[PDB]
């Protein structure tokens, strides 16, 4: 038992409104390693609270597509 938590921050694109933006994160929470998720669309950003041993980008990118969104990584 351990499972750390970390908070990523990333950009978003390809969206209707600051509401579907919630459902992507909230749906995304339902994957493994993820525990919370919070779209900070107030400043056009998204934050995802997950375990980066169990999750990573992988499941997130997979889901992001399926949810009908795309995120952008201007930070790396
Ligand atoms: Cu919407």
UniProtKB/Swiss-Prot annotation:
Recorded superkingdom: Bacteria
Induction: By Cu(2+).
HMA domain ranges (all copies): 6-72
Coiled coil start-end: none
Sequence positions that bind Cu(+) 1: 17, 20
Compartment(s): Cell membrane
Protein's job: Involved in copper export.
Family: Belongs to the cation transport ATPase (P-type) (TC 3.A.3) family. Type IB subfamily.
Misc note: The copZA operon is activated by CueR and indirectly repressed by YfmP.
Quaternary context: Monomer at sub-stoichiometric copper concentrations. Homodimer at higher copper concentrations. Forms a heterodimer (electrostatic interactions) with CopZ during the transfer of Cu(+).
Protein name in the entry: Copper-exporting P-type ATPase
Gene designation: copA
Residues represented out of the complete protein: 1 to 75 of 802
């Amino acid at each position: 038992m351990l499972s750390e938590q970390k908070e990523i921050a990333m950009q978003v694109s390809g969206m209707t409104c600051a509401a579907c933006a919630a459902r992507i994160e909230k749906g995304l929470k339902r994957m493994p390693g993820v525990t919370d998720a919070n779209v900070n669309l107030a400043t056009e950003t998204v934050n995802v609270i997950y375990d980066p041993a169990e999750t990573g980008t992988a499941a997130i990118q997979e889901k992001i597509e399926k949810l009908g969104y795309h995120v952008v990584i201007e930070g790396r």
